[PDB]
Amino acid sequence: EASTIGPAFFTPQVLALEVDCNIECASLLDLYGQIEVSRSTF
Amino acid sequence: EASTIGPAFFTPQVLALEVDCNIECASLLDLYGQIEVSRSTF
């Protein structure tokens, strides 16, 4: 009898899923002047 | 080895910028009347 015969004879069915709700900043990068050095000192 | 051997084995990458940040003022010399002259005391 259901709900009396245990806790896991029935298997849940996984569905498509992606719930994230993780946030980031904006990007204050393209504003600044850009330099591409090659050594580690300039 | 490194980081304890002089400071002359490492040649910095001389990048090609030259920060200036010096305002002149603003020009006001094209409004005035212009006259070429000769020997002084006209």
UniProtKB/TrEMBL annotation, chains A, B:
UniProt protein name: Major capsid protein
Lineage: Viruses, Duplodnaviria, Heunggongvirae, Uroviricota, Caudoviricetes
